[PDB]
Amino acid sequence: AQLDSIGFSIIKKCIHAVETRGINEQGLYRIVGVNSRVQKLLSILMDPETEICAEWEIKTITSALKTYLRMLPGPLMMYQFQRSFIKAAKLENQESRVSEIHSLVHRLPEKNRQMLHLLMNHLAKVADNHKQNLMTVANLGVVFGPTLLRPTVAAIMDIKFQNIVIEILIENHEKIFNTVPE
After folding, report:
1. What is the CATH number that goes with domain 1-182?
2. What does the DSSP 8-state code read for residue 149?
C-alpha cells in the first residue's frame, strides 16, 4: 500500500492484536501464515477504531504486517538512506554505531520515522518475551532486515549488516526515537 492513514491503521491494528493475544506464540513473524487468508485480511484492512476479530490466526496477522511492508513503493528505511545505514552499522565502535544511526533516523521524513517507531517499540516487547516465543533480537533482525531495507555486485557481503541495523534499532529504540541526536 502507501504510507497513508490506512497504512498506520493496518500497522496499529496488527501490533495491538499480536501484543494483546499473541505475545507468547512461538516463532512470531518467522512462521508464515496461509497466503490465502493473509490476502483476505489485507483486503479487509484496506478500506470499507475497530480491532481484528479473534477468527484471525496470529500467523495470519503477522504475515499481513510483513507483506504490507513489502508492498510499499519503496523500503521504509528508504533507498536514499540505505547505504548510510549500512555504513553506520559497520563502525568498529559499539557506540559510534548508535549515534550515526540515531542521527540518520531523525533525518527521515516524519511518516517513515513514525511507522519505524511503532514497529521497533513493538519488536522490543516481542523480544523481551523470547524465552517463550523464541524470538530474540537477533532472530527478529533476520526477519525484518530484508523487509525494511530492500537490497547488485559485491554488495552481497553487506546483507548481513542490514540485519545489524534492525538489531540496533530494537535495542536502543527508547533513546533513538524519544530523544533528539547529540
Report:
1. 1.10.555.10
2. S
